[PDB]
Write an enzyme that holds these catalytic residues in place. Structure first.
Site, PDB file in Angstrom:
ATOM      1  CG  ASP B  58       3.967  -4.932   8.450  1.00 44.51           C
ATOM      2  OD1 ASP B  58       4.130  -3.694   8.277  1.00 44.51           O
ATOM      3  OD2 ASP B  58       4.033  -5.751   7.514  1.00 44.51           O
ATOM      4  CG  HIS B  60       1.814  -9.756   9.621  1.00 50.12           C
ATOM      5  ND1 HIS B  60       0.954  -9.961   8.551  1.00 50.12           N
ATOM      6  CD2 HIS B  60       2.872  -9.082   9.121  1.00 50.12           C
ATOM      7  CE1 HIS B  60       1.474  -9.430   7.470  1.00 50.12           C
ATOM      8  NE2 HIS B  60       2.648  -8.896   7.784  1.00 50.12           N
ATOM      9  CG  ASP B  86       0.786  -6.181   5.871  1.00 47.73           C
ATOM     10  OD1 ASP B  86      -0.124  -5.941   5.044  1.00 47.73           O
ATOM     11  OD2 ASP B  86       1.906  -6.609   5.529  1.00 47.73           O
ATOM     12  CG  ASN B 118       1.046  -6.538   1.288  1.00 46.45           C
ATOM     13  OD1 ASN B 118       1.339  -5.932   2.330  1.00 46.45           O
ATOM     14  ND2 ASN B 118       1.670  -7.653   0.904  1.00 46.45           N
ATOM     15  CG  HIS B 167       1.598  -1.856   3.914  1.00 46.63           C
ATOM     16  ND1 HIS B 167       1.830  -2.168   5.247  1.00 46.63           N
ATOM     17  CD2 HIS B 167       1.950  -2.955   3.211  1.00 46.63           C
ATOM     18  CE1 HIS B 167       2.276  -3.401   5.334  1.00 46.63           C
ATOM     19  NE2 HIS B 167       2.355  -3.911   4.109  1.00 46.63           N
ATOM     20  NE  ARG B 215       7.764  -6.687  -0.815  1.00 40.72           N
ATOM     21  CZ  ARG B 215       7.645  -7.073   0.452  1.00 40.72           C
ATOM     22  NH1 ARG B 215       6.897  -8.126   0.765  1.00 40.72           N
ATOM     23  NH2 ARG B 215       8.278  -6.405   1.410  1.00 40.72           N
ATOM     24  CG  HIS B 242       5.505  -3.922   2.426  1.00 50.44           C
ATOM     25  ND1 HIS B 242       4.632  -4.988   2.411  1.00 50.44           N
ATOM     26  CD2 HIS B 242       6.050  -3.860   1.187  1.00 50.44           C
ATOM     27  CE1 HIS B 242       4.685  -5.575   1.225  1.00 50.44           C
ATOM     28  NE2 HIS B 242       5.529  -4.905   0.464  1.00 50.44           N
TER      29      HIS B 242
HETATM   30 MN   LIG Z   1       3.727  -7.559   6.253  1.00 50.29          MN
HETATM   31 MN   LIG Z   2       3.042  -5.919   3.688  1.00 52.31          MN
END
Ligand SMILES: [Mn+2]
Ligand SMILES: [Mn+2]
Ligand SMILES: [Cl-]
Lengths: 35, 294
Positions: B58, B60, B86, B118, B167, B215, B242
């Site tokens: 990730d 982000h 991500d 996601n 992911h 989640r 993830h």
């Molecule tokens: Mn993430």
């Molecule tokens: Mn994720």
């Protein structure tokens, strides 16, 4: 008989070469959560 | 489309303190989206890749950390890359992040790869920052444009028939690789099913088989599930992302699965290191870890 295909296998290095580190100057305002 | 100029401007801010924005034009970004979209569709949804390459988790929107990763790992085309998804949400600079990644995809389409996470989903990034970032710095129309791009990202990768990459993780609906190949693009990410799981599931040490996920989406899976999957498909390793992990990487089920997370000090709320995994010609794997100097 007929030769087998070349296959690669996942391995890991000896335990002192598994990880190598690199460093950054931590600025606490650089990363935020916009939410 | 002037890719070299776009890339030059994106890399120009490296070393800045404080970190600057890079503000591309609206049409430059739309160009990146449209040209990268074509490349995603012209390539399989289940990529088949050869080592050597570097694999990242990730990001982000932590754009300066991405530059740090490239600085140490080698800027394309010096190294081959596979990112696990991500790219946007949570961080300050989702736009610079995704733009540089798309630019590299267009410039080095055979040596640079991006999977879908996601957060590359409109329903998700409407909430977690990317929508706001686009609306603030450009317009909502541009956000929809990214959405169309994201909807065409590939879903999984297999490196030299031995490392399965995605992911999130595994799916109980995943019995054959062909089911992945069969998925049609463009597509959104559904609330349930194979595509959902590949982007959303997590390994769990305390579950046997398939469990529910906290989640509220997808599932958890245990070590035995991993073993049976690798055995059935003649694979050695699952590489996924993830979940933020303290050392930047974390093993699961002996060394049969690894979680990678590349954004260090994740959104200012965690003390994690960020890691990438180097896979050499022989599939010997190792970790390059980014942490504070202190
Ligand atoms: Mn993430
Ligand atoms: Mn994720
Ligand atoms: Cl299990």
């Amino acid at each position: 008989g007929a030769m087998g295909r070349k296959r690669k296998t996942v391995t890991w290095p000896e335990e002192g070469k598994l990880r190598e580190y690199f460093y950054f100057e931590l600025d606490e305002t650089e990363r935020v959560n916009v939410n | 489309l002037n890719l070299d100029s776009i890339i030059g401007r994106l890399l120009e801010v490296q070393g800045s303190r404080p970190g600057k924005n890079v503000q591309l034009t609206e049409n430059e970004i739309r160009g990146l989206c449209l040209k990268s979209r074509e490349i995603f569709l012209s390539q399989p949804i289940l990529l088949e890749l050869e080592a050597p390459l570097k694999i990242c988790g990730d990001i982000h929107g932590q754009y300066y950390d991405l530059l740090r990763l490239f600085e140490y790992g080698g800027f394309p085309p010096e190294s081959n890359y596979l990112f696990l998804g991500d790219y946007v949400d949570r961080g300050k600079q989702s736009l610079e992040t995704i733009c540089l990644l798309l630019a590299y995809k267009i410039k080095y389409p055979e040596n640079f790869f991006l999977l879908r996470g996601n957060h590359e989903c409109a329903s998700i990034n409407r909430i977690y920052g990317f929508y706001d970032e686009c609306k603030r710095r450009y317009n909502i129309k541009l956000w929809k444009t990214f959405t169309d791009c994201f909807n065409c990202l590939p879903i999984a990768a297999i490196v030299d028939e031995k490392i399965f990459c995605c992911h999130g993780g595994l799916s109980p609906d995943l019995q054959s690789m062909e089911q992945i190949r069969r998925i049609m693009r463009p597509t959104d990410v559904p609330d349930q099913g194979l595509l959902c799981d590949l982007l959303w599931s997590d390994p769990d040490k305390d579950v046997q088989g398939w469990g529910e996920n906290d989640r509220g989406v997808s599932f958890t899976f245990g070590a035995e599930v991993v073993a049976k999957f690798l055995h059935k498909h003649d694979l050695d390793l699952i590489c996924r992302a993830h979940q933020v992990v303290e050392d930047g990487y974390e093993f699961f089920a002996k060394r049969q699965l690894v979680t990678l997370f590349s954004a260090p000090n994740y959104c200012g709320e965690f003390d994690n290191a960020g890691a990438m995994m180097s896979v050499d010609e022989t599939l010997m794997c190792s970790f390059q870890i980014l942490k504070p100097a202190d």
